[PDB]
Amino acid sequence: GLFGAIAGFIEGGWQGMVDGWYGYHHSNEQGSGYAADKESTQKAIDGITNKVNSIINKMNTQFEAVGREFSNLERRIENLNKKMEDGFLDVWTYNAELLVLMENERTLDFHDSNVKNLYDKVRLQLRDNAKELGNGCFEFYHKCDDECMESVKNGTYDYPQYSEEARLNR
Amino acid sequence: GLFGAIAGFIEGGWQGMVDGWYGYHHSNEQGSGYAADKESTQKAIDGITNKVNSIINKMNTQFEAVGREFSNLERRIENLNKKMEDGFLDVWTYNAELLVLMENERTLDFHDSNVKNLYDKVRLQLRDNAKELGNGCFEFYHKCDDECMESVKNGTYDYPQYSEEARLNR
Amino acid sequence: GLFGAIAGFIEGGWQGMVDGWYGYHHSNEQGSGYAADKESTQKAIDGITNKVNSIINKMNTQFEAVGREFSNLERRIENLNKKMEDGFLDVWTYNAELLVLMENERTLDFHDSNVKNLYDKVRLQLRDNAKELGNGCFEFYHKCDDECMESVKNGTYDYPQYSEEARLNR
Amino acid sequence: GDQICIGYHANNSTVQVDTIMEKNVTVTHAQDILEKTHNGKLCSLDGVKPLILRDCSVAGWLLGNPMCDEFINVPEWSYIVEKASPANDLCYPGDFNDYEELKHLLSRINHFEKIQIIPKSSWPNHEASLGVSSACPYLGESSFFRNVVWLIKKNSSYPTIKRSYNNTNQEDLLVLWGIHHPNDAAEQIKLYQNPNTYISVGTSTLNQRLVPTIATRSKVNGQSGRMEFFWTILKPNDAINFESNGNFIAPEYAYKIVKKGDSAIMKSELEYGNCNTKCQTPMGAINSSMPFHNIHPLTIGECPKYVKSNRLVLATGLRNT
Amino acid sequence: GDQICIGYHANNSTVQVDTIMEKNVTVTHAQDILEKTHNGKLCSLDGVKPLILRDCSVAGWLLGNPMCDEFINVPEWSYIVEKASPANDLCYPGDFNDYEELKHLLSRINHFEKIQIIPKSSWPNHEASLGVSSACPYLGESSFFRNVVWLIKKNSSYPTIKRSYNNTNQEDLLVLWGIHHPNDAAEQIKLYQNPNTYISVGTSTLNQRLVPTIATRSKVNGQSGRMEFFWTILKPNDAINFESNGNFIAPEYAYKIVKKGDSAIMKSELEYGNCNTKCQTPMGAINSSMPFHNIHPLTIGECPKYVKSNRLVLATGLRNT
Amino acid sequence: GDQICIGYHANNSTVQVDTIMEKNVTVTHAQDILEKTHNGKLCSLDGVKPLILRDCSVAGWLLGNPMCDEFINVPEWSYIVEKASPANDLCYPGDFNDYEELKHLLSRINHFEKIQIIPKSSWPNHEASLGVSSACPYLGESSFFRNVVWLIKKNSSYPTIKRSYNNTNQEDLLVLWGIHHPNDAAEQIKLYQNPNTYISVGTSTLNQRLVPTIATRSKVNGQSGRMEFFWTILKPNDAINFESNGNFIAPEYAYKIVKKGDSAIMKSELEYGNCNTKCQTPMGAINSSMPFHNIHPLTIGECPKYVKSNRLVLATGLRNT
Ligand SMILES: *[C@@H]1O[C@H](CO)[C@@H](O[C@@H]2O[C@H](CO)[C@@H](O)[C@H](O)[C@H]2NC(C)=O)[C@H](O)[C@H]1NC(C)=O
Ligand SMILES: *[C@@H]1O[C@H](CO)[C@@H](O[C@@H]2O[C@H](CO)[C@@H](O)[C@H](O)[C@H]2NC(C)=O)[C@H](O)[C@H]1NC(C)=O
Ligand SMILES: *[C@@H]1O[C@H](CO)[C@@H](O[C@@H]2O[C@H](CO)[C@@H](O)[C@H](O)[C@H]2NC(C)=O)[C@H](O)[C@H]1NC(C)=O
Ligand SMILES: *[C@@H]1O[C@H](CO)[C@@H](O)[C@H](O)[C@H]1NC(C)=O
Ligand SMILES: *[C@@H]1O[C@H](CO)[C@@H](O)[C@H](O)[C@H]1NC(C)=O
Ligand SMILES: *[C@@H]1O[C@H](CO)[C@@H](O)[C@H](O)[C@H]1NC(C)=O
């Protein structure tokens, strides 16, 4: 991937993460389990839905062929008419195939960007209070509460709390 | 953002940074204040100006409609003529709206990429002689001179100098 | 660059790295020398070859002009015919120039993305057993075997081995 | 040590999409945007049945080819359907002047009302029923186009015709008439008596003078003679005036243009499907929320945009592991 | 501990732009690229005034409809302006042969110079002034197109005309002539004496033979007769030859094609604005450094490219906080 | 301390490419996709030689202009090549009816076989060899188009012609005939005796009646008279019938349409190059694996797609240091 998160340093996707697209899997003494990150997942949904619509309502202005008939002494304009309509047909065909192709590719790297952004959001919060295995996971130099976990997800994780147990636990 | 710098881990833009687009705000004992990073800001300007021009001089070759008149016994070709010109009009309209739309989106992530690149330029220079709050800021494990600050901006910041006071200040 | 690797924090390319596009240059007691990273380099080749083909086989459907002749009392349709063919010619010209222009730009940042991805692959493996000069290089807090080097390239580099000599060598 | 991980979705979906750099990429969620199916019927278009011309051409219908009596009185249509090569066109051989321009005007018409403008019985100085040809048989006897009258001399003479019709209707009238080109000058006199004949026609915008051209022609439908047909649109409160001393194929019935709107003349081998639709192609109707279809480029109605692709699929999800 | 931060720009700008994934994104700097305004006048085009035809058609002008004397002598133009349905066209009813092909040739002409090729006084064997119709009144008396002569018999006879004109000018000549179609054969003889008449015309490239077709037509402008007009381009050092024994509407004045170049025939209800411009549309002129405009697709001059958009705005800055 | 570095490629390549944001970017590997060269010859197209018409028009060739004897019998061609303004067209001045429609039908024809349908010697009641004009000289003596016969009266009379030809061939026939328009009525009688003359022609689909129009015309190639030529396609087992008492230019030779396929009529000043090609333009042939070329838009064969660019170059490598 261009951002290297999906099929990258996070080599595999989660079958068991059915809530949303990207998210978390905590694991502490009080049990583990998958939680979707609803904020990034809804950011991504707003975006993709708007992209489909965009694509559709840009092809609203598209050539609509009409049938005309010519006599056997009108062969030149019958030909011009044919070439003219075939031409608009190929143009607008190229346009749809090439737009789908380019926005498809853009769509993936968007998801790649989002997982990476999410992975960096946690990382930039935990600082040195956690280890970076580099495989998509962070291990806390302290113990983490099921309410401390959600605090990293929420974006409130308190650094000047465990700032002690982590620093003295190395 | 796709690079996650703007409206990301740098949650807010600076009203007071009027010099340029991206840049710095130092704060040491000798006073603080905003400085634009003129090298990245001029890189971005070269780029956007060329992009506008590009867009304009690619639509230089654009269909220019001509008025033709047909009698009431020429309805078929009058119709073909109408459809033919309407068609080129919709094609080149789709083209401009879709190019502006795609280059608009590309333009933003460019600015996003640039702030991130800039944020990484400092970061890769300061190494462990500074703390990474993760909010867009770096705090020096040593004291920084107004001429040491500009040295990070310039790209000359000397690591094998404060390499001591920072390492022993933890 | 948008990913900031090429002409970025790796300010220069290697004349002596003739094997492939991106890769390595180890330097230990047993000798140095350039090795291409064949996996990323073949990833990039698969991609670019498919992109050329794509571009070519999307312009397969392109307007093919035909010669028609009109009398001096047919000036209106002769004109319509001219405008009609010139028009399809400008449309498909815009299309090729604008696609080459956009995929050119996309092509570079792809290479930029790949070097960065590669640089992050090593980095995420070595963790604290190496220093990050930030210039494209990693210095091991331990000594590295010519077979330990290839182990980082391969993706097998063993962290729970030198995990000692590096930690105690600071 | 407690641990937190950033991870993404994956499932047992197998649908592939293409990108510029990579084709057949299996994605976790996609959206197909191409409609590729239809019913295979010609359907009423929003409750309005098409006029399906069976084995008759548009010429066969508007002139009243005796093989075309199913269309002697046609209801309002959404669109008209005509075969590639309808068997019943011009039973007596000849030409229809500016035919394609008329078929074009039809694409814009939704309903006619046939009316009698010149009664066949109102020709006391000529023979109005005589009238007929083996080239145009009906039920095994000699017949002729029903909407026009092949007038022949009476008691050995053909007095010059000066006939006018004034359109006292609210609507435009499609009026049709013709001229017969005989194979010899002796057939000419046998039929019309006058060896030198003409047909003049005038309205506020029309001014034509016909002369029957005699030539030796191959037989078509057993005839070496030819019929040539002409039409015009007569505006309300305008009149048409005729004048001829021979070879005149007079109008009897004309067409009130009662409904105008969006129409089309569709070329299709199919016939009425007994269904309803909002989008019809020559091959069958389409019912789809899809924004593209690849069935046929000449459609009628509220239709998805036609592309020539085999498949168009939008990746909405992420790469699937 | 001293601190350094990487930050970006933001301001009190509120202009939005669209992207594929997001619309109404407030950006710190944008560039509008669509010109949406005009003056509402028809202006001289780089110092050259248009020919504004007022209530006259191009036919009214070139034939010399008496209602069209304002154009008896027209200066060089940049472009020509003609209304949708000009009131003054063919005062005496009829047709203008290959009219649209002539209007097309005009889009390519910048200046005429009317010249007298056959003096009205040079018709000693016929009546040159008699000439006139109530369908073409001027100041309450019967008049006629000024550029042609309706020749009538003299002292009860119409001798056959053999007239030639040789183009001894440097430039091509637009030449116009016609034929009168009477309503009866008794009007024919009243006017031309000869019951069977023709008009032959020839040049190096032309070879035509006209016969007046008589028919009974509705009255238009009070007349059942018709005038049919014809034109050609006569190359320098070529001659035109006429021959007629009746129904001939002779040329008097022709047009020297003094200037050729880029022109256009613009359809507009507007009239001269008394301004200057480098880009004109049917609705008014445009003065803009903008690379796109959405005013009207048929423009003349150094113009921005026409798109059908409501708004086209290029994001140049970054997202605004 | 041992050290490992991540680095990329660079070399001594200097080829530039453009992007949206940056032009003249030196890249380590590029792919030029525009073919910009040709040979400058008109070549056989996959082993089939073109028909190069030299100084003759298509009209000159099909009528048999005596200056065009090189094409009296032409082999199968791939395409036809005709100059902008061929010197040899209609030696005796006149017109060729629906000429462009015929040239269009040629683009679809690969081979003719001239056959004699009406022998010049089979005209016992007229003069078949007399026949000739100074406007059409051959080797310093008066000549005429070779494929048609200018029939003149014999021993002071011109009996009415009734001639038919039945196409007993497998293939369609291109048939050509004509009418002579004299300058006066005294030339008329000198040539054909009958002052009032016609030419009728009929087939299963054709029905025409020609009358020679007499006018006083400028001299072209020394002649004030005109020839007007007509053509049709005669289907196997159909016949053409002629009838004339004057002014008839009879067919002698016609053209069997032996091969139909893909062809073209190319306008070029060039002549045969003695080479082979798979792609030909008016300027010279192209031999290229390139997916685009910018030589000329009207090409024939297996060709790269034509764009109007100066340069099209695809970056395949990375930025070069
Ligand atoms: C056709 O008949 C109408 C109605 O009789 C004629 O109408 C002329 O002008 C107005 C139209 O509304 C009528 O009120 C007048 O009474 C009519 N004028 C005359 C002199 O009768 C119309 O003129 C007729 N058309 C033709 C070609 O004769
Ligand atoms: C029109 O008049 C011109 C000039 O008198 C005629 O010109 C012929 O050929 C050249 C043209 O430059 C003249 O120098 C000759 O003197 C002219 N030939 C003759 C025999 O006079 C031109 O022929 C005239 N056009 C017509 C149709 O008669
Ligand atoms: C041209 O000649 C052919 C062959 O003689 C004529 O053919 C007619 O119909 C079939 C066609 O296959 C022949 O087998 C018959 O013998 C022909 N009919 C008659 C009555 O002879 C064809 O009709 C001729 N064309 C014309 C216009 O006369
Ligand atoms: C398509 O038509 C069928 C048959 O009436 C109907 O059951 C179905 O709901 C329709 N679907 C749409 C999307 O119109
Ligand atoms: C537009 O025209 C006005 C009026 O002459 C003039 O003042 C103004 O400078 C012009 N601007 C441009 C861009 O031409
Ligand atoms: C081009 O033609 C030349 C001459 O025959 C030949 O030598 C060369 O191999 C050809 N190249 C291609 C790509 O066809």
Question: What ranges do the domains of chain F cover?
Answer: 1-48+271-321, 49-270
Chain position carrying tokens 């008596």: D193
Query: Could you give the dihedral angle defined by the CA atoms of residues A85, A89, A90 and A96, in that order, rounded to the nearest 10 degrees?
Result: 160
Q: How many Å is the maximal CA-CA distance in chain D?
A: 123
CA nearest ligand 5 atom 9, residue: E287
Q: Among partner residues E204, E238, E243, which is closest to F216 by beta-carbon distance?
A: E243
How many residues does the structure list for chain A? 170
DSSP character for D221? T
What CA–CA distances, in Å, run from D290 to D26, D37, D293? 22, 11, 7
- CA C164 to chain E, closest CA, distance in angstroms equals 32
Residue A153: which H helix or E strand, with range? Answer: helix A146-154
Q: Select from F165, F205, F207, F230 the residue whose CB has the most chain D CBs within 10 Å, as the one to mutate to test that interface.
A: F207
First CA to last CA distance, chain E: 29
What is the C-alpha radius of gyration for chain D, rounded to an integer number of angstroms? 29
Other Cβ atoms within 10 Å of C78 Cβ, number: 17
Rounded to 5°, angle at Cα F83 from F81 and F84: 135
SS3 A125: helix
Q: Work out the end-to-end distance of chain F between its first and last CA atoms, rounded to an integer number of angstroms.
A: 29
Residues 6+ apart with CB under 8 A from E100: B68, B69, B70, B71, B74, C76
Which of A2, A87, A132 is closest, CB to CB, to C63?
A87
| Calculated CA dihedral for residues B77, B79, B80, B86, nearest 10 degrees | 140
Q: Give the residue from chain B lying closest to C96, CA to CA.
A: B58
- Look at residue E101 and give its three-state secondary structure: helix
Tell me which architecture the domain covering D49-270 has in CATH.
Alpha-Beta Complex (3.90)
CB contact under 8 A, F20 and B61: no
Burial of F275 (0-12, 13-18, 19+ CB in 10 A): middle
Ligand 3 mutation target, pool F165, F168, F237, most atoms within 8 A of CB: F237
Centre a 10 Å sphere on the Cβ of residue C34 and count the other Cβ atoms it contains: 18
Whether E20 and chain A come into contact, CB under 8 Å, resolves to yes
CA nearest ligand 5 atom 2, residue: E287
CA separation for the pair D294, B152 (Å, rounded): 60
Chains in touch with B (3+ beta-carbon pairs under 8 Å) read A, C, D, E, F
Specify the residue for token string 């978390």: A24
Smallest Cα–Cα separation from D250: which of D142, D152, D172, D174? D152
* Contact between chains at A27 and D18 (C-beta distance less than 8 A): no
Distance of CA E310 to the CA centre of its chain: 32
> Phi and psi for F292 in degrees, rounded to 5?
-140, 150
Residue minimizing CA distance to atom 6 of ligand 5: E287
User: What stretches of E22-161 show up as alpha helix (H) in DSSP?
Assistant: 58-63, 99-106
Q: Residue D217: nearest ligand to its CA?
A: 3
Question: In this complex, which chains have at least 3 CB pairs below 8 Å with chain D?
Answer: A, B, C, E, F
How far off is chain C from F304, nearest CA to CA, in Å? 9
Which atom of ligand 2 is closest in space to residue E166's alpha carbon? 1
Q: Does F104 contact chain D (CB < 8 Å)? A: no
Choose among C101, F305, A91: nearest CA to F295.
F305
Which domains are assigned to chain B? Answer: 1-170 (3.90.20.10)
CB atoms D215 and F164 under 8 Å: no
Please tell me if residue E98 touches chain C, with a CB cutoff of 8 Å.
yes
CATH number for the domain running over E1-48+271-321? 2.10.77.10
DSSP A163: T
Which residues line ligand 1 at a C-beta cut-off of 6 Å?
D 166, 168, 237-239; E 218
A103/E20 CB distance under 8 A? yes
Rounded to 5°, angle at Cα F17 from F13 and F18? 155
Sheet holding D292-293, edge to edge: D34-35, D292-293, D305-306
Distance E64 CA to ligand 5 centre (A): 40
In total, chain F counts a number of residues equal to: 321
C7: alpha, beta or left, given left = phi > 0 and alpha = psi -120 to 50? Answer: left
In our burial notation (b when 16+ CB lie closer than 10 A, e otherwise), range B146-157 reads: eebbebbbeeeb
Contacts of D259 (CB under 8 A, 6+ apart): D76, D109, D110, D111
By the 8 A CB rule, do A133 and A123 touch?
A: no
Structure tokens at F85: 């303004």
CA–CA dist F152, F191 (Å, integer): 6
Nearest to E20 among B56, B65, B101 (CB): B101
Helix (H) or strand (E) holding F162: strand F161-166
| Best CA proximity match to D52, nearest among D33, D30, D68 | D68
Structure tokens that stand for D150 in this block: 């092949």
Answer for the pair E252, E148: CB distance below 8 angstroms, yes or no. yes
Find, in chain E, the residue whose alpha carbon is nearest to that of C77.
Answer: E101
Spatial distance between the Cα atoms of E32 and E90, rounded to a whole number of angstroms: 48
Tokens of D68: 């075309």
User: For residue C67, what is the enclosing H or E element?
Assistant: none
Q: This structure's resolution (angstroms)?
A: 2.0
Method: X-ray
Grouping H, G, I as helix, E, B as strand and the rest as coil, residue D305 is strand
In degrees and rounded to multiples of 5, residue C74 shows phi and psi of: -115, 25
Counting beta carbons within 10 angstroms of the beta carbon of residue D113, is it exposed (0 to 12), middle (13 to 18) or buried (19 or more)?
middle
Distance D237 CA to ligand 1 centre (A): 6
148-177 in F: which are within 8 Å (CB) of D?
162, 164
Around C19, how many Cα atoms within 13 Å sit in the side-chain half-sphere?
A: 17
Task: Work out the burial of residue C84: count CB atoms within 10 Å of its CB; fewer than 13 is exposed, 13-18 middle, 19 or more buried.
Answer: buried
Contact list in A for residue B91 (CB cut-off 8 A) is: 63, 88, 91-92
CA dist B98 and B94 (Å) reads 6
E279 alpha carbon to ligand 5 midpoint, in Å? 12
* Ligand 5 atom nearest residue E288's Cα: 13
